[PDB]
Short mmCIF file of C-alpha atoms in Angstrom, two decimals:
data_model
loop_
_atom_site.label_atom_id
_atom_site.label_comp_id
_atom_site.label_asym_id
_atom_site.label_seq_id
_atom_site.Cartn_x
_atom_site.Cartn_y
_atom_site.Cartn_z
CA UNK A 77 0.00 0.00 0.00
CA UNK A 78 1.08 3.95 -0.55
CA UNK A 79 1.83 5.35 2.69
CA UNK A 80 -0.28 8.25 2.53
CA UNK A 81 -2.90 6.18 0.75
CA UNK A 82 -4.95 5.68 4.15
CA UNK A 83 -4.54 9.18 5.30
CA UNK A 84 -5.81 10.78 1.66
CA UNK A 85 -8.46 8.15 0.86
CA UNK A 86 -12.16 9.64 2.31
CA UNK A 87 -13.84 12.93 2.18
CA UNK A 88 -12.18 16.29 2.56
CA UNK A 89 -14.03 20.04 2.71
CA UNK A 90 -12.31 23.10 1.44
CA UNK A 91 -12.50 26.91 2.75
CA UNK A 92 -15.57 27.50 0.36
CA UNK A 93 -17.53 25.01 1.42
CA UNK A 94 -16.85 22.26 -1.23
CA UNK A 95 -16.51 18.55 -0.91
CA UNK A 96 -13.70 16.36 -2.26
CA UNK A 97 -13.87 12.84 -2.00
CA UNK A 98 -11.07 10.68 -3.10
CA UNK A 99 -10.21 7.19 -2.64
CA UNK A 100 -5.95 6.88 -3.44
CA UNK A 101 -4.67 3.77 -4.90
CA UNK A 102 -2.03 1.95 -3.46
CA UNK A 103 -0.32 2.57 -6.95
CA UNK A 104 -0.66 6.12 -6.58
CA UNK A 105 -4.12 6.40 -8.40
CA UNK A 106 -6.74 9.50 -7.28
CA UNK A 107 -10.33 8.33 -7.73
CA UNK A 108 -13.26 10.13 -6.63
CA UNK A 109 -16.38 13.12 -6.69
CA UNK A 110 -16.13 16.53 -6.32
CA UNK A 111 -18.33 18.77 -5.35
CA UNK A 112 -18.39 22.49 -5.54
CA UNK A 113 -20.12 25.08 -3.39
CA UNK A 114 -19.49 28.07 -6.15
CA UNK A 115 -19.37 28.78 -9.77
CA UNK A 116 -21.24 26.90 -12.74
CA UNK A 117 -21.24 23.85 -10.98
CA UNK A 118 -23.94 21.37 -9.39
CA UNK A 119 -24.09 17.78 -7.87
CA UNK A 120 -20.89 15.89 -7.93
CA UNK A 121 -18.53 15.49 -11.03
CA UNK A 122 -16.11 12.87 -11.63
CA UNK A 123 -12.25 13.49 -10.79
CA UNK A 124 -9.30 11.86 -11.19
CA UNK A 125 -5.78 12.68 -10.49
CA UNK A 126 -2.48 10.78 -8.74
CA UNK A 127 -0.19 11.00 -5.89
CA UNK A 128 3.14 9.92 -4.54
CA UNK A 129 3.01 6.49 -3.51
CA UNK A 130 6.38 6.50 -1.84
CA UNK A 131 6.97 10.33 -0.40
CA UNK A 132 10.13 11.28 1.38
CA UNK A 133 10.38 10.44 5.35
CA UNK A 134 12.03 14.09 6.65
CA UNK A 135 8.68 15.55 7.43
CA UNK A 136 7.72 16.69 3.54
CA UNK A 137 4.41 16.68 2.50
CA UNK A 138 2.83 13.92 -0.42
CA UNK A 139 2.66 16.03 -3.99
CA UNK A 140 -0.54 14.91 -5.64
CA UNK A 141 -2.81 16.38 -7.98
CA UNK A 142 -6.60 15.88 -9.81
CA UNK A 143 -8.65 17.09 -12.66
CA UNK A 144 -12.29 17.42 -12.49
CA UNK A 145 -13.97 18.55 -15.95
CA UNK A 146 -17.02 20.58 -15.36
CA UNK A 147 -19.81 18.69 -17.28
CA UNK A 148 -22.25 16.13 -15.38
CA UNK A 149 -25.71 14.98 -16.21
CA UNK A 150 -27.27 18.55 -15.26
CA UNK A 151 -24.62 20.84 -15.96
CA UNK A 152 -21.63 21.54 -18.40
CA UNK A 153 -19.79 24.76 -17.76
CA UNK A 154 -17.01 24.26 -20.73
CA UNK A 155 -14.28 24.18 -18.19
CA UNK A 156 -11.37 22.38 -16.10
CA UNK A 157 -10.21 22.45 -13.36
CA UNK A 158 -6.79 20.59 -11.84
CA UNK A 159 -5.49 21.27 -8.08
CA UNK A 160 -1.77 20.85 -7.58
CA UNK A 161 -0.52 20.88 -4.06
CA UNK A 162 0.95 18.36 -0.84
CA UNK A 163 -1.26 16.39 1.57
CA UNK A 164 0.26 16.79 5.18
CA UNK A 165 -0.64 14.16 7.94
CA UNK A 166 -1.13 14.56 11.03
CA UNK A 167 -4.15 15.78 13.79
CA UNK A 168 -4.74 18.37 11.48
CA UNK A 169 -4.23 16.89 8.54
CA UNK A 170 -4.65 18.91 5.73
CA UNK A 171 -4.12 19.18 1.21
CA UNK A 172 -2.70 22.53 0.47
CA UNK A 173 -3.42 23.62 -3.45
CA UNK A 174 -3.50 25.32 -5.82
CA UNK A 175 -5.42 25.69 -8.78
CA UNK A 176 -6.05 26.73 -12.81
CA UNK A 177 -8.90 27.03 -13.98
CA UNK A 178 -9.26 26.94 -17.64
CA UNK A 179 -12.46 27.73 -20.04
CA UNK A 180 -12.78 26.66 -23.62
CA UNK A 181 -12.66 29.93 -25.42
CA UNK A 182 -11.83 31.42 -28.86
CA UNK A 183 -8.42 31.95 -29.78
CA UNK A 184 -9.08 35.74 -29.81
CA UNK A 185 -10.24 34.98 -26.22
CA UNK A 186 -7.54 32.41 -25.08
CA UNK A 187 -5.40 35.10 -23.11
CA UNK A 188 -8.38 35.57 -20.57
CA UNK A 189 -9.27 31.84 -20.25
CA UNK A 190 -7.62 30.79 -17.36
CA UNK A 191 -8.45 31.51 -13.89
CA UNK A 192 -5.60 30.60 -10.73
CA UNK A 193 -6.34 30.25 -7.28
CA UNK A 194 -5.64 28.09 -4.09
CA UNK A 195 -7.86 25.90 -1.79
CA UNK A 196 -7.16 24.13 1.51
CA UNK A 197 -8.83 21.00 2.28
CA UNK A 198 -9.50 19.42 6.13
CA UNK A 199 -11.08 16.64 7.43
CA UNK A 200 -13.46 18.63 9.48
CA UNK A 201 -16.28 21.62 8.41
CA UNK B 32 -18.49 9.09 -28.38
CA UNK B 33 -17.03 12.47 -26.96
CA UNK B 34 -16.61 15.53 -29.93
CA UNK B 35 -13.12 15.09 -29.65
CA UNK B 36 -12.49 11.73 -28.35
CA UNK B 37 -11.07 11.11 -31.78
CA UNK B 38 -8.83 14.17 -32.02
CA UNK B 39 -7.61 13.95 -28.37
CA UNK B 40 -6.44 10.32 -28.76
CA UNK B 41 -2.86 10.03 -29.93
CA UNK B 42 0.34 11.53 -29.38
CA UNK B 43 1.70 14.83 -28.48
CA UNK B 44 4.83 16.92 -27.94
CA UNK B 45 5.85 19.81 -26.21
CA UNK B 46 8.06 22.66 -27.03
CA UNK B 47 10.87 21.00 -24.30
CA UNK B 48 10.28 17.85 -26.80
CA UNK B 49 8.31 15.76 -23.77
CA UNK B 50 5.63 13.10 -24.72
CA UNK B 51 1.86 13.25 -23.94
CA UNK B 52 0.77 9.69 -25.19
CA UNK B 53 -2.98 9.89 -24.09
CA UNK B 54 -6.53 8.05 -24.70
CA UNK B 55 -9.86 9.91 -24.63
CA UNK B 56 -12.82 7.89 -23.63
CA UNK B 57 -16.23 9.06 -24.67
CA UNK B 58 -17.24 10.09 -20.62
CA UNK B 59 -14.76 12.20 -20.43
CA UNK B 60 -11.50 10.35 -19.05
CA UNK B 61 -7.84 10.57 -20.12
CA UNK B 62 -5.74 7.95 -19.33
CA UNK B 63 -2.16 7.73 -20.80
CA UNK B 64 1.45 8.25 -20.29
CA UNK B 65 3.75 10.93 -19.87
CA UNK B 66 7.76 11.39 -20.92
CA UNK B 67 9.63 14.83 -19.95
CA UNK B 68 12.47 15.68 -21.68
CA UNK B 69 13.81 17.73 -19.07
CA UNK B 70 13.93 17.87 -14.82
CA UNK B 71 13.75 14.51 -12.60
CA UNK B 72 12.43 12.54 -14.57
CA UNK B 73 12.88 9.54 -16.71
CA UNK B 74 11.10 7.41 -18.72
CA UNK B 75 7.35 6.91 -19.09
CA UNK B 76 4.86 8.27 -16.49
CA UNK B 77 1.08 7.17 -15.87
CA UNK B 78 -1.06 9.80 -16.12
CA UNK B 79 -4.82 10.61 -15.78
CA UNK B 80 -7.26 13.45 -16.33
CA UNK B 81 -10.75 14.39 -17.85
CA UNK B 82 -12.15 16.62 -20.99
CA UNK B 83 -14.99 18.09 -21.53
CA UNK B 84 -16.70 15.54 -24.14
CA UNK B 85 -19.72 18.00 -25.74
CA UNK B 86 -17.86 21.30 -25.85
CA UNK B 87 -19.27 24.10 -27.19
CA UNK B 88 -19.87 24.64 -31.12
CA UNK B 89 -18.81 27.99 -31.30
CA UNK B 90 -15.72 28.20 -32.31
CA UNK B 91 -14.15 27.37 -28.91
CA UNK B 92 -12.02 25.17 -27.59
CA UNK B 93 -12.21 22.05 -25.43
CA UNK B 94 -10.75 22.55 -22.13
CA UNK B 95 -9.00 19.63 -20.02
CA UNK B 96 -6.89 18.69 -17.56
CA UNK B 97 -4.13 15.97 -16.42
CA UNK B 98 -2.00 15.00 -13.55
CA UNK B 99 1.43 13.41 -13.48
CA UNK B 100 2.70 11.92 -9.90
CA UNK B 101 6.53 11.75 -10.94
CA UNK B 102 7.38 8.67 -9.21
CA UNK B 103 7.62 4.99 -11.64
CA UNK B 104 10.21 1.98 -11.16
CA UNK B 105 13.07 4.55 -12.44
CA UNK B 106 12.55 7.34 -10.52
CA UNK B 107 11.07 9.39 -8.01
CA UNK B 108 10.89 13.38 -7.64
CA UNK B 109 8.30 13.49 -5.02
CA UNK B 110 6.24 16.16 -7.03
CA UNK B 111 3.23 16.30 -9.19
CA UNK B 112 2.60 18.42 -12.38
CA UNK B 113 -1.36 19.11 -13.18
CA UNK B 114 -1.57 20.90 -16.67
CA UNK B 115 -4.57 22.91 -17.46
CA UNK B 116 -5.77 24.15 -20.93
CA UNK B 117 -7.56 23.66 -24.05
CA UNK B 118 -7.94 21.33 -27.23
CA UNK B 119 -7.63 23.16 -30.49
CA UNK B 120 -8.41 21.45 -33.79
CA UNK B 121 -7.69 21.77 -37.02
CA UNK B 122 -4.79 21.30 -39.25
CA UNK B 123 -2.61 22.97 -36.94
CA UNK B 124 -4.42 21.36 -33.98
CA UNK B 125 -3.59 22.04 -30.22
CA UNK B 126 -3.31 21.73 -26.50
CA UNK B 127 -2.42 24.96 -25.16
CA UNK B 128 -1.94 24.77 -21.13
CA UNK B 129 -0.75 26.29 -18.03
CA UNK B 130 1.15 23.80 -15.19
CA UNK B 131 1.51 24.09 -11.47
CA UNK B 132 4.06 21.35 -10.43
CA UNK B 133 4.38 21.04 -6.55
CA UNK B 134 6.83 19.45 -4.80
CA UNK B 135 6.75 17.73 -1.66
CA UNK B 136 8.05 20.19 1.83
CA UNK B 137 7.75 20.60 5.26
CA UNK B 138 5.65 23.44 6.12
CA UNK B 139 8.92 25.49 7.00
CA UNK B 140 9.10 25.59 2.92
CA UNK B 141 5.78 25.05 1.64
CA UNK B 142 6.01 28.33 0.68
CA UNK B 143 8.61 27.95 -2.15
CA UNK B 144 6.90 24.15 -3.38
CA UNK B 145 4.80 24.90 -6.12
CA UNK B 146 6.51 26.13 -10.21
CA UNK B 147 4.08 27.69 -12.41
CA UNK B 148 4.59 27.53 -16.20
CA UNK B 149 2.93 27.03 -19.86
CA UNK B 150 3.29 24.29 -22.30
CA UNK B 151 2.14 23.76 -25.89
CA UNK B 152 1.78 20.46 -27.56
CA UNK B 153 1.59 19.66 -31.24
CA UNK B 154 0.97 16.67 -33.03
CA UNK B 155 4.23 16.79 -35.03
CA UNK B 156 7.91 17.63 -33.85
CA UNK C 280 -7.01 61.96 -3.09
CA UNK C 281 -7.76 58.05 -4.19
CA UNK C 282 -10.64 56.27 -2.76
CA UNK C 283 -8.74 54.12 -0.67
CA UNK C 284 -5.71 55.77 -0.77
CA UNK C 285 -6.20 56.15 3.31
CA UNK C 286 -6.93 52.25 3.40
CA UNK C 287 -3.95 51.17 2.07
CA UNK C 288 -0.92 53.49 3.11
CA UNK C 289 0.70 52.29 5.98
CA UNK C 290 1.96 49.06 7.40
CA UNK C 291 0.74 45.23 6.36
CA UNK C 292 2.08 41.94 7.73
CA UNK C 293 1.25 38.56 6.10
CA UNK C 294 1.06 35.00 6.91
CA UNK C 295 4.46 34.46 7.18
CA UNK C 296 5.13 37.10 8.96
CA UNK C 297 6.64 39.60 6.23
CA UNK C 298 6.21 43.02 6.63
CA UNK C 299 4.59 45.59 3.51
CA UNK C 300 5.22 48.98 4.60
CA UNK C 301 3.40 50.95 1.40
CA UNK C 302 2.33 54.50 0.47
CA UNK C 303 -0.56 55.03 -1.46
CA UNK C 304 -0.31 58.22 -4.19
CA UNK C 305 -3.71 59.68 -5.46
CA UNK C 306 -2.83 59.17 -8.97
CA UNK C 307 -2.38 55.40 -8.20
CA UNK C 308 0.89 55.27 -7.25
CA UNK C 309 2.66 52.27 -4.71
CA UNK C 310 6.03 53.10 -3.33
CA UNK C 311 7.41 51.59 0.19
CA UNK C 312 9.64 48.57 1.33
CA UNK C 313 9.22 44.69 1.70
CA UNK C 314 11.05 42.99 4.56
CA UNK C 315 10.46 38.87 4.09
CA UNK C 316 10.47 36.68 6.93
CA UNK C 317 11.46 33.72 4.19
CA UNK C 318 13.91 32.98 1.56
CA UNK C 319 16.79 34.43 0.19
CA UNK C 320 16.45 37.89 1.72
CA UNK C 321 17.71 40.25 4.73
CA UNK C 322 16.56 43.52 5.57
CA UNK C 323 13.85 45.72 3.33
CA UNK C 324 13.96 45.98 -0.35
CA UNK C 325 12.59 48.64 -2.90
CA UNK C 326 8.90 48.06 -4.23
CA UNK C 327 6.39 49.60 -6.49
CA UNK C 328 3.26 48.91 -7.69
CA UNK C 329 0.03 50.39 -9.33
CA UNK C 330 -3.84 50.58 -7.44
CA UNK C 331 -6.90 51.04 -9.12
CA UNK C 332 -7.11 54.90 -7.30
CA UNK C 333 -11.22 55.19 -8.65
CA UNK C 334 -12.74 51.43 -7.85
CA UNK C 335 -16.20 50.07 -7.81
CA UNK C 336 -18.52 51.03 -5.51
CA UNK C 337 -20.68 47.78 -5.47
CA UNK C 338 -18.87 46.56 -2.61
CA UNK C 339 -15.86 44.82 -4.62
CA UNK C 340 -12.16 45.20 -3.55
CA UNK C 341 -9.65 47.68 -4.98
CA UNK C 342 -7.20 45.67 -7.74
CA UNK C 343 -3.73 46.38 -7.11
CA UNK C 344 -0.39 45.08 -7.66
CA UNK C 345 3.52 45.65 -6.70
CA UNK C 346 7.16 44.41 -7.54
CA UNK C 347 10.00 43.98 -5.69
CA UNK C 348 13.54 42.96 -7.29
CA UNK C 349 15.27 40.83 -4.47
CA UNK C 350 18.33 43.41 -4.82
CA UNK C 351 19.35 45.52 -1.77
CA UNK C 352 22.72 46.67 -0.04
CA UNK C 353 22.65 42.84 1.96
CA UNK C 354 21.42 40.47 -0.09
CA UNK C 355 20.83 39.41 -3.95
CA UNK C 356 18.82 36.66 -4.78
CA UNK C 357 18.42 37.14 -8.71
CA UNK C 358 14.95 36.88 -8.66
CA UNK C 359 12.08 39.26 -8.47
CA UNK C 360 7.52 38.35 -6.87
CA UNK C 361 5.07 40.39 -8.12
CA UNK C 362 2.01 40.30 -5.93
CA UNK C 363 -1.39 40.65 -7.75
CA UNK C 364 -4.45 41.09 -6.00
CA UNK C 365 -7.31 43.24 -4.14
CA UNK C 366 -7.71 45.02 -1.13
CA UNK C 367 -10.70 44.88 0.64
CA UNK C 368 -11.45 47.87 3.60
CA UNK C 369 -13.36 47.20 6.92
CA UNK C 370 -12.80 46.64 10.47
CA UNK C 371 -11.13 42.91 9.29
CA UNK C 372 -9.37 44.82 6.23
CA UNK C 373 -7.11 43.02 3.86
CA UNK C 374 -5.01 42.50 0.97
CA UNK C 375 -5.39 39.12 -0.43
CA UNK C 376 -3.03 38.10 -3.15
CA UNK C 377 -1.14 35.69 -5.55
CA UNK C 378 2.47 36.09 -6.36
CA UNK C 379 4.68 35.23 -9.09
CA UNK C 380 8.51 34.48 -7.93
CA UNK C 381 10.74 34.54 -11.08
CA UNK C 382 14.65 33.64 -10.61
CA UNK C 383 17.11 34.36 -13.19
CA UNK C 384 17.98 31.04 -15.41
CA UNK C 385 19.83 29.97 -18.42
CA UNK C 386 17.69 29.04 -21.12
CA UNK C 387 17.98 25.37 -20.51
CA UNK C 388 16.78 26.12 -17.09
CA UNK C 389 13.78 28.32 -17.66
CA UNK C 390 10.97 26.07 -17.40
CA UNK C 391 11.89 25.91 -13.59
CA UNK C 392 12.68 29.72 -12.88
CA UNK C 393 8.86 30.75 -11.72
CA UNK C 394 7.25 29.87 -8.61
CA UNK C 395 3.90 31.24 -7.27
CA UNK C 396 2.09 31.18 -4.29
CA UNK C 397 -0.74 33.32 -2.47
CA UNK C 398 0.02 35.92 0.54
CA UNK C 399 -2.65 37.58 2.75
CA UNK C 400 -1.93 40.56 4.14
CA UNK C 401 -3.66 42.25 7.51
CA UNK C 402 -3.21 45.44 9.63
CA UNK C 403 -2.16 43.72 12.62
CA UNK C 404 0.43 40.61 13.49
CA UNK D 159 24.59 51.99 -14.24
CA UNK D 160 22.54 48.80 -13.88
CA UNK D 161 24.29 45.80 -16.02
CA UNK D 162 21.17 45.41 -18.42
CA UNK D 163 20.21 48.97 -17.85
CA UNK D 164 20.58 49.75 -21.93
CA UNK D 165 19.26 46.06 -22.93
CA UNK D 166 16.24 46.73 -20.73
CA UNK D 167 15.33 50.09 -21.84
CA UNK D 168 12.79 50.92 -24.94
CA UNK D 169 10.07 49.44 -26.88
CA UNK D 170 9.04 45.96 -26.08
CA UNK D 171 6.04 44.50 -28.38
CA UNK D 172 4.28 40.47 -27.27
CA UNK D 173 2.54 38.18 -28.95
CA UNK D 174 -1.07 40.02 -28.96
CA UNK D 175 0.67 42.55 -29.78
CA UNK D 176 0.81 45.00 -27.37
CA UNK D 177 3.68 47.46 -26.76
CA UNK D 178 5.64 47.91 -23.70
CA UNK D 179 7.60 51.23 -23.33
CA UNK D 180 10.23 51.52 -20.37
CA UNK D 181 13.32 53.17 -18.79
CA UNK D 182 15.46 51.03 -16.41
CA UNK D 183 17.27 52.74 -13.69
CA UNK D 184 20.62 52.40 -12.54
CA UNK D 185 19.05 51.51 -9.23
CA UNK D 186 16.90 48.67 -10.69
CA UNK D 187 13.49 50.97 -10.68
CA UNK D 188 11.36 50.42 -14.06
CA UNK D 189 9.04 53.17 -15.61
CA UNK D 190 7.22 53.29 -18.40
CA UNK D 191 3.59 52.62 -20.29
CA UNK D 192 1.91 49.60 -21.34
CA UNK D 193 -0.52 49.84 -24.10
CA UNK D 194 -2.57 46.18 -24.70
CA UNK D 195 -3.72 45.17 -28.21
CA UNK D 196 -6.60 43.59 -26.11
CA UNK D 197 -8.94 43.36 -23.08
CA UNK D 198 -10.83 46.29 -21.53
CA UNK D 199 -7.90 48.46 -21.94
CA UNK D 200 -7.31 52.17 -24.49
CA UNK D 201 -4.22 53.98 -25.20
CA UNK D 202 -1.12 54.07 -22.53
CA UNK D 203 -1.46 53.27 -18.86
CA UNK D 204 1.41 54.11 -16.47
CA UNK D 205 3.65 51.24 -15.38
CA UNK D 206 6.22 51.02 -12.75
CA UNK D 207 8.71 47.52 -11.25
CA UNK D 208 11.93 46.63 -10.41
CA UNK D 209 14.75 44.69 -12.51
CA UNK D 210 17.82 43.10 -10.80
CA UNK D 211 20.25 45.52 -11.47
CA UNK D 212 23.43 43.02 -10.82
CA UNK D 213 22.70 39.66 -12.73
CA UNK D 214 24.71 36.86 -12.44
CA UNK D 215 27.26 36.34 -14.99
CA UNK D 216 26.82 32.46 -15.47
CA UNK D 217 24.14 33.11 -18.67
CA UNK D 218 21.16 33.23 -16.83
CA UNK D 219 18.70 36.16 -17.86
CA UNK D 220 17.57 39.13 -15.16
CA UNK D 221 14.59 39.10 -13.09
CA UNK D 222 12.43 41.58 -13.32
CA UNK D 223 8.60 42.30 -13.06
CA UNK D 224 6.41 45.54 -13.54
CA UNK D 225 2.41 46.56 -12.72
CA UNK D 226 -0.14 47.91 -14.36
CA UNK D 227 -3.52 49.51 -12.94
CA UNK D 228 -6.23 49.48 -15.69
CA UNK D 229 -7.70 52.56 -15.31
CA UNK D 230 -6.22 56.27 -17.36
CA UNK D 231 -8.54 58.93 -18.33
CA UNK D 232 -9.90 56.92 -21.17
CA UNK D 233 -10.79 53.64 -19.02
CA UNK D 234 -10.91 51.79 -15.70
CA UNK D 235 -11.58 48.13 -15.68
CA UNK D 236 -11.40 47.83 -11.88
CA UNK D 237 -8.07 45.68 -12.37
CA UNK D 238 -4.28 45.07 -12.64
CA UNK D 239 -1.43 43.00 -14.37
CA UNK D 240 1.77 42.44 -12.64
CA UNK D 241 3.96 40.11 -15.14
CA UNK D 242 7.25 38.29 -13.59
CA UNK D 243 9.74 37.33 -15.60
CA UNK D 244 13.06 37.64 -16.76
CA UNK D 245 15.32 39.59 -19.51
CA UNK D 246 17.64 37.39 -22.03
CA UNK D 247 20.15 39.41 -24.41
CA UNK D 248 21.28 38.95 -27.22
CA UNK D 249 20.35 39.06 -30.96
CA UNK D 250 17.10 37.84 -30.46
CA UNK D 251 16.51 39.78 -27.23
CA UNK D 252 13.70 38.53 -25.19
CA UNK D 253 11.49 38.89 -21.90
CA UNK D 254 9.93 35.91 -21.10
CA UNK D 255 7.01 36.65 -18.74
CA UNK D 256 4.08 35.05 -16.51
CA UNK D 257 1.23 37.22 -15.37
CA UNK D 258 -1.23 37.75 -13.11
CA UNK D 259 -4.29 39.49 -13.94
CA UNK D 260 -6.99 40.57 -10.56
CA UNK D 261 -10.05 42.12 -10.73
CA UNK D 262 -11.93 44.09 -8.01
CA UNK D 263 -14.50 41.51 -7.11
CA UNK D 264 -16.79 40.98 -4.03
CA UNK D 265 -15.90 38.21 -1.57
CA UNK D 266 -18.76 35.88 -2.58
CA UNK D 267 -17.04 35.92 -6.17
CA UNK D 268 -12.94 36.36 -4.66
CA UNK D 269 -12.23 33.00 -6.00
CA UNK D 270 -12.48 33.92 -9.83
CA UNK D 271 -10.82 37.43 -9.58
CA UNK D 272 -7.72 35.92 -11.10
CA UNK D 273 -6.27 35.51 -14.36
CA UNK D 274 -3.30 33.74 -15.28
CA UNK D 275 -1.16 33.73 -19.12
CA UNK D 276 2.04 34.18 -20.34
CA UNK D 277 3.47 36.99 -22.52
CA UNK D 278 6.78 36.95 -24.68
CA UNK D 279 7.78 40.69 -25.20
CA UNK D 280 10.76 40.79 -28.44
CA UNK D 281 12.13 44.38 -29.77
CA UNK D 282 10.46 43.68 -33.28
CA UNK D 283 6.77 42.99 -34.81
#
């Protein structure tokens, strides 16, 4: 098994209210549902992403990453998102990201089609 | 099948001459592997993401998304590259995206873990 | 005089404990110092930046953005952040940002000379 | 005077092609105006950043990054650019940028106030 893979696998809540839930592989596979509390976005949409099976043991966080394409049964908002960032164990365990954001557009339009941020996921909330 | 399930499919290169080798399935997935020509790396890389598989008609593009964990049997660089952008046809057809690659840290240095930068893949070169 | 030209002059500490001393011109002007509590740096450095000196009155934030070169009589680190970002007024008030850390690289080196992160800045701390 | 001090100053023109007018400083201070072929943006707006002024002498370009508020007597769209990036010499002169664009935005909408892209400024076109 990865060694973070018990301490990533189950549900995680960001600082806008949004709901990640993510079972890891013990190959370093991200499977899951994501769930956003803003934008053009309802219900849960299918994500997928990997981690670092074997991290370093000095205390470093676990790099992963996921995608989550913005079209379910009741909504399509031409759009993808994928969150970059390091899970970090512990009593308050938590993933640290960031984030692009990036809308189909023309190519007149392409310079303004990408939106970056950063989220913070806990168990708790 | 997705709009451009059939387009997606194949293989791609990037101006540092890395390999996107990638399958579209028509729900949305991308499954595949990655080769960089440059950093810690070597060899082939799994990698998974998602498109958006009924884009719009107008003229725009298709956005999507992808992770690479850059740990196989060769190699590990405990760190995790998600690129985000858009699908392009055509004859000169496209995947224009921004990356966030974060690195594994102790909190001390979280704040120096994550490089930001673009890539563009072609289907020839 | 700018709108929030009185919100912003003065002094602003983030969450790593950096200090943003800034002065706030009517025409839109930012002049002051950085000090970082992280990295390759000692002492304060020369910034500058631009504000949006008429914003909306809808209740948005005031865009806004500065540079500093990591260049002083100390230290040189070869790099230069730019923060981007808003600042919001109010008894809480804040500047909220994302940065852009670029190092100086040969070419060969480039695609890892960029790093970026997100600071929050607040009156007191 | 600053090492790239005369390699730095004058007309820079990018991809979308906008044009980029600046003076370096001895110092490392950057002045200037910044006129984009696109976006919610008319005639010059006022720029100001800060270059390293001592590069290293190992081939590796010079950091540097600059701001621009959108708003001039013609236009204000509530937002500003800071680009980060660094100066190459040479016969086909360059400055390689990443940007971050941030609108004035309520909280409720705080997580889409920012753009990301990439602009590659040359002396010609």
């Amino acid at each position: 098994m990865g060694r973070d893979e018990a301490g990533i696998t189950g549900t995680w809540y960001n600082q806008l209210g949004s709901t990640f839930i993510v079972t890891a592989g013990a190959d370093g596979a991200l499977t899951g549902t994501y769930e956003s509390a803003v934008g053009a976005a309802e219900s849960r949409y299918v994500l997928t992403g990997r981690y670092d099976s074997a991290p370093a043991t000095d205390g470093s966080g676990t790099a992963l990453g996921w995608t989550v394409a913005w079209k379910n049964n009741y909504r399509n908002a031409h759009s993808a998102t994928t969150w970059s960032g390091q899970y970090v164990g512990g009593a308050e365990a938590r993933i640290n990201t960031q984030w692009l954001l990036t809308s189909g557009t023309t190519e007149a339009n392409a310079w303004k089609s990408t939106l970056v941020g950063h989220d913070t996921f806990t168990k708790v909330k």
